[PDB]
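Case study.
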Amino acid sequence: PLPQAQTPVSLNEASLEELMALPGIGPVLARRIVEGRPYARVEDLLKVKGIGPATLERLRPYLRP
Ligand SMILES: [Cl-]
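After joint prediction, the assembly is written out as follows.
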């Protein structure tokens, strides 16, 4: 349950657990997201292995750099 008080979630500053609260993001993807930092824009998430456009499409409303 991703609480409202934690959104939008920062791709650059969130902890692993916070990223794992995002729909479709498990421990493996959360780890790759941290390892891929920094992100200049949310669309840079496409550099992370496993995050396809359909995945990203669902996450856009909840993310910020
Ligand atoms: Cl952005």
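Observations recorded in class. The longest strand covers residues 9-10. Strands lie at 9-10, 63-64. We will return to this complex in the next lecture.
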